[PDB]
Design an enzyme around this catalytic site. Structure first.
Site, PDB file in Angstrom:
ATOM      1  N   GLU A 243       0.813  -1.198   0.000  1.00  0.00           N
ATOM      2  CA  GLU A 243       0.000   0.000   0.000  1.00  0.00           C
ATOM      3  C   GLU A 243       0.847   1.248   0.000  1.00  0.00           C
ATOM      4  OE1 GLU A 243      -2.880  -0.382  -1.011  1.00  0.00           O
ATOM      5  OE2 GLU A 243      -2.920  -2.491  -0.383  1.00  0.00           O
ATOM      6  N   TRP A 246       1.472   1.910  -3.453  1.00  0.00           N
ATOM      7  CA  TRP A 246       0.446   2.570  -4.237  1.00  0.00           C
ATOM      8  C   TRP A 246       0.510   4.075  -4.119  1.00  0.00           C
ATOM      9  CZ3 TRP A 246      -3.422   1.524  -7.713  1.00  0.00           C
ATOM     10  CH2 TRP A 246      -3.672   0.174  -8.013  1.00  0.00           C
ATOM     11  N   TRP A 274     -20.764  13.387 -18.831  1.00  0.00           N
ATOM     12  CA  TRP A 274     -21.131  13.917 -17.500  1.00  0.00           C
ATOM     13  C   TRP A 274     -22.330  14.869 -17.578  1.00  0.00           C
ATOM     14  CZ3 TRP A 274     -18.647  10.152 -16.128  1.00  0.00           C
ATOM     15  CH2 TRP A 274     -17.354   9.867 -16.656  1.00  0.00           C
ATOM     16  N   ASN A 309      -9.966   3.612   3.080  1.00  0.00           N
ATOM     17  CA  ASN A 309      -9.897   3.249   1.660  1.00  0.00           C
ATOM     18  C   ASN A 309     -11.201   2.711   1.048  1.00  0.00           C
ATOM     19  OD1 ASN A 309      -8.500   3.443  -0.835  1.00  0.00           O
ATOM     20  ND2 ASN A 309      -8.521   1.245  -0.945  1.00  0.00           N
ATOM     21  N   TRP A 327     -16.164  14.191 -12.753  1.00  0.00           N
ATOM     22  CA  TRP A 327     -15.035  13.949 -11.900  1.00  0.00           C
ATOM     23  C   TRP A 327     -14.262  15.207 -11.382  1.00  0.00           C
ATOM     24  CZ3 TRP A 327      -9.717  14.193 -13.248  1.00  0.00           C
ATOM     25  CH2 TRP A 327      -9.456  14.434 -14.623  1.00  0.00           C
ATOM     26  N   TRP A 350      -9.513   8.694  -7.714  1.00  0.00           N
ATOM     27  CA  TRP A 350     -10.701   9.028  -8.504  1.00  0.00           C
ATOM     28  C   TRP A 350     -10.641   8.281  -9.815  1.00  0.00           C
ATOM     29  CZ3 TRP A 350     -15.326  11.159  -7.536  1.00  0.00           C
ATOM     30  CH2 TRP A 350     -15.452  11.656  -6.221  1.00  0.00           C
TER      31      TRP A 350
HETATM   32  C1  FAD Z   1     -11.127   8.004  -3.993  1.00  0.00           C
HETATM   33  C2  FAD Z   1      -9.736   7.954  -3.409  1.00  0.00           C
HETATM   34  C3  FAD Z   1      -9.109   9.141  -2.986  1.00  0.00           C
HETATM   35  C4  FAD Z   1      -8.039   9.077  -2.097  1.00  0.00           C
HETATM   36  N1  FAD Z   1      -7.348  10.243  -1.829  1.00  0.00           N
HETATM   37  C5  FAD Z   1      -6.201  10.209  -1.046  1.00  0.00           C
HETATM   38  C6  FAD Z   1      -5.562  11.438  -0.643  1.00  0.00           C
HETATM   39  O1  FAD Z   1      -5.935  12.594  -1.057  1.00  0.00           O
HETATM   40  N2  FAD Z   1      -4.467  11.327   0.235  1.00  0.00           N
HETATM   41  C7  FAD Z   1      -4.120  10.035   0.665  1.00  0.00           C
HETATM   42  O2  FAD Z   1      -3.270   9.806   1.464  1.00  0.00           O
HETATM   43  N3  FAD Z   1      -4.740   8.880   0.275  1.00  0.00           N
HETATM   44  C8  FAD Z   1      -5.808   8.942  -0.553  1.00  0.00           C
HETATM   45  N4  FAD Z   1      -6.430   7.720  -0.877  1.00  0.00           N
HETATM   46  C9  FAD Z   1      -5.701   6.395  -0.811  1.00  0.00           C
HETATM   47  C10 FAD Z   1      -6.045   5.660   0.499  1.00  0.00           C
HETATM   48  O3  FAD Z   1      -7.472   5.579   0.566  1.00  0.00           O
HETATM   49  C11 FAD Z   1      -5.622   6.370   1.799  1.00  0.00           C
HETATM   50  O4  FAD Z   1      -4.314   6.979   1.861  1.00  0.00           O
HETATM   51  C12 FAD Z   1      -5.856   5.424   2.975  1.00  0.00           C
HETATM   52  O5  FAD Z   1      -7.225   5.455   3.243  1.00  0.00           O
HETATM   53  C13 FAD Z   1      -5.167   5.981   4.212  1.00  0.00           C
HETATM   54  O6  FAD Z   1      -5.608   5.300   5.389  1.00  0.00           O
HETATM   55  P1  FAD Z   1      -4.472   4.580   6.302  1.00  0.00           P
HETATM   56  O7  FAD Z   1      -3.418   5.651   6.659  1.00  0.00           O
HETATM   57  O8  FAD Z   1      -5.055   3.818   7.447  1.00  0.00           O
HETATM   58  O9  FAD Z   1      -3.806   3.580   5.233  1.00  0.00           O
HETATM   59  P2  FAD Z   1      -3.056   2.196   5.518  1.00  0.00           P
HETATM   60  O10 FAD Z   1      -4.010   1.056   5.153  1.00  0.00           O
HETATM   61  O11 FAD Z   1      -2.498   2.094   6.945  1.00  0.00           O
HETATM   62  O12 FAD Z   1      -1.865   2.256   4.428  1.00  0.00           O
HETATM   63  C14 FAD Z   1      -0.519   2.633   4.713  1.00  0.00           C
HETATM   64  C15 FAD Z   1      -0.205   3.897   3.876  1.00  0.00           C
HETATM   65  O13 FAD Z   1      -0.024   3.584   2.480  1.00  0.00           O
HETATM   66  C16 FAD Z   1      -0.582   4.618   1.638  1.00  0.00           C
HETATM   67  N5  FAD Z   1      -1.766   4.139   0.907  1.00  0.00           N
HETATM   68  C17 FAD Z   1      -2.718   3.221   1.397  1.00  0.00           C
HETATM   69  N6  FAD Z   1      -3.624   3.030   0.381  1.00  0.00           N
HETATM   70  C18 FAD Z   1      -3.291   3.807  -0.699  1.00  0.00           C
HETATM   71  C19 FAD Z   1      -3.880   4.008  -1.947  1.00  0.00           C
HETATM   72  N7  FAD Z   1      -5.014   3.381  -2.299  1.00  0.00           N
HETATM   73  N8  FAD Z   1      -3.285   4.857  -2.855  1.00  0.00           N
HETATM   74  C20 FAD Z   1      -2.183   5.587  -2.468  1.00  0.00           C
HETATM   75  N9  FAD Z   1      -1.603   5.381  -1.246  1.00  0.00           N
HETATM   76  C21 FAD Z   1      -2.120   4.500  -0.380  1.00  0.00           C
HETATM   77  C22 FAD Z   1      -1.133   5.689   2.557  1.00  0.00           C
HETATM   78  O14 FAD Z   1      -0.185   6.720   2.716  1.00  0.00           O
HETATM   79  C23 FAD Z   1      -1.328   4.964   3.881  1.00  0.00           C
HETATM   80  O15 FAD Z   1      -1.340   5.910   4.938  1.00  0.00           O
HETATM   81  C24 FAD Z   1      -7.525   7.816  -1.691  1.00  0.00           C
HETATM   82  C25 FAD Z   1      -8.067   6.661  -2.162  1.00  0.00           C
HETATM   83  C26 FAD Z   1      -9.243   6.726  -2.943  1.00  0.00           C
HETATM   84  C27 FAD Z   1      -9.974   5.448  -3.268  1.00  0.00           C
END
Ligand code: FAD
Ligand code: IRF
Ligand code: CL
Ligand code: CL
Length: 419
Positions: A243, A246, A274, A309, A327, A350
């Site tokens: 993650e 990602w 849209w 997420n 979007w 997105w």
């Molecule tokens: C619609 C959409 C918009 C989002 N916008 C953002 C945003 O503006 N800023 C943001 O930090 N995250 C965003 N996320 C990605 C992800 O949802 C979050 O970072 C995650 O929810 C963070 O929660 P956590 O710290 O407990 O993650 P954990 O599950 O503990 O993951 C560890 C770390 O890995 C990174 N990470 C985890 N999932 C993703 C992912 N899908 N894509 C990129 N990095 C990831 C994050 O930095 C996270 O803190 C978005 C995802 C979606 C689906």
């Protein structure tokens, strides 16, 4: 002559290459600039940034050193602090974003002494020769974290200038600063890591680290987080780090595919019709859509600045696929609600959720919203915390008919997509 250390989205002492690169040459004085280009945004994010600056100064003061904070344009203030301190040079972490490049270009012209930029620590860098749209081929280049760099031990004495103004976040914030962030990381690695892979997809987001607000300002280093998960090891460990990857991949895409910020990555979606529609934008935006799961998500985000997420990918797809909202409007408004809101990452989300061509996520994948609720919140607890209006994930005068609209999207979309 002191070396200046210019902290941008890297408000930490630990694993800080520009901070060390300067500290080995001579005495330092750190600098933040509160830049209107980043801080004309919502109160919640101005405060989160400002309180992290405040914690970064407390962190300098505590080790005996000096952090200027100045306000205005970087190409006007970095030179000013250069002159006022007589600095021999300024140091910072490279930024490969279009504003990064523009500001950094302009600062380097107005500065009369060098500006030395160093690679930010990443799991993988965003500016690699090859361009991938798929995560898997990209993630394979990764071989495990390099060791993070120590923090300084004690900083040299220097004069301190600047005020950190105080702003109303409008809501409760996390504990600011890298001391809170590293405690959070070690609790997480210690209590939840074993189950991460089983637990990551709940709607309450309570099986994850909740550290995004910190990774967004660089209050925690992604190479320190990964290196540390790699020492703990085991199963949770691989998947958590996948993650973090990602996040790097999100910067990879926006770098190689800049036009992505204007239009769907997939050419076949660039002419999608849209339907702007104020009435409906407002009901998504304010969580009043009649869909238990989307109004819980939208209402937690409003109150908290945070969303899991699995709620995000649901809340966001719903706008695009069931409401057909444009979007750009949505995904902007989304990022403004989030403490951790991060242009590239939110765009990558997105485009993934919305089926517009991140990682070849297929258009056909449509969240059934009650289904999504029954698989990811097993006895209601989450839904009752954020919208107890609703007795279950059964919809309740929904602003559209769900199947009419499921059937609608799949239809518009199969022409376009593979026609
Ligand atoms: C619609 C959409 C918009 C989002 N916008 C953002 C945003 O503006 N800023 C943001 O930090 N995250 C965003 N996320 C990605 C992800 O949802 C979050 O970072 C995650 O929810 C963070 O929660 P956590 O710290 O407990 O993650 P954990 O599950 O503990 O993951 C560890 C770390 O890995 C990174 N990470 C985890 N999932 C993703 C992912 N899908 N894509 C990129 N990095 C990831 C994050 O930095 C996270 O803190 C978005 C995802 C979606 C689906
Ligand atoms: C909500 C929010 C506010 C921010 N404010 C910044 C600021 O006032 N000055 C700055 O140098 N960096 C600021 N950052 C990080 C910038 O995006 C920075 O230019 C990026 O680190 C490029 O180095 C910033 C990030 C985020 I989220
Ligand atoms: Cl150089
Ligand atoms: Cl190293």
């Amino acid at each position: 002559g002191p070396l200046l250390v210019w902290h941008r989205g890297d408000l930490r002492l630990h694993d800080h290459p520009a901070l060390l690169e300067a500290l080995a040459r001579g005495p330092v004085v750190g600098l933040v600039v509160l830049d209107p280009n980043n801080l004309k945004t919502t109160p919640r994010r101005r405060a989160w940034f400002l309180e992290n600056v405040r914690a970064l100064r407390e962190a300098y003061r505590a080790r005996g050193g000096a952090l200027w904070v100045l306000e205005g344009l970087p190409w006007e203030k970095v030179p000013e602090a250069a002159r006022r301190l007589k600095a021999k040079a300024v140091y910072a972490l490279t930024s490969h974003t279009p504003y990064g490049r523009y500001r950094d270009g302009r600062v380097r012209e107005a500065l009369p002494v060098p500006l030395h930029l160093l690679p930010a620590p990443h799991l993988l860098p965003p500016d690699l020769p090859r361009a991938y749209r798929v995560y898997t081929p990209f993630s394979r280049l990764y071989r495990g974290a390099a060791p993070p760099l120590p923090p300084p031990e004690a900083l040299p004495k220097g004069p301190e200038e600047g005020e950190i103004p105080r702003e109303d976040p409008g809501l409760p914030l996390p504990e600011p600063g890298e001391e809170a962030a590293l405690a959070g990381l070690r609790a997480f690695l210690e209590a939840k890591l074993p189950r991460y892979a089983e637990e990551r997809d709940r709607l309450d987001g309570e099986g994850g680290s909740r550290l995004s607000p910190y990774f967004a300002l660089g209050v925690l280093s992604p190479r320190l987080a990964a290196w540390e998960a790699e020492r703990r090891g085991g199963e949770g460990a691989r998947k958590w780090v996948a993650e973090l990857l990602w996040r790097d991949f999100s910067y990879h895409l926006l770098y190689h595919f800049p036009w992505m910020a204007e239009r769907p990555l997939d050419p076949r979606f660039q002419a999608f019709p849209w339907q702007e529609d104020e009435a409906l934008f407002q009901a998504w935006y304010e969580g009043k859509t009649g869909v238990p799961l989307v109004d819980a998500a939208m209402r937690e985000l409003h109150a908290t600045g945070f969303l899991s997420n699995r709620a995000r990918m649901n809340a966001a797809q719903f706008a695009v696929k069931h409401l057909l909202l444009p979007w750009k409007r949505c995904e902007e408004a989304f990022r403004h609600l989030l403490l951790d809101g991060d242009r590239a990452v939110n765009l990558q989300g997105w485009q993934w959720a919305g089926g517009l061509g991140v990682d070849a996520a297929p258009y056909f994948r449509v969240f059934n919203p009650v289904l999504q609720g029954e698989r990811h919140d097993p006895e209601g607890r989450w839904l009752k915390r954020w919208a107890p209006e609703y007795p279950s994930y059964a919809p309740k005068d929904p602003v559209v008919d769900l199947e009419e609209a499921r059937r609608r999207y799949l239809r518009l979309a199969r022409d376009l997509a593979r026609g």
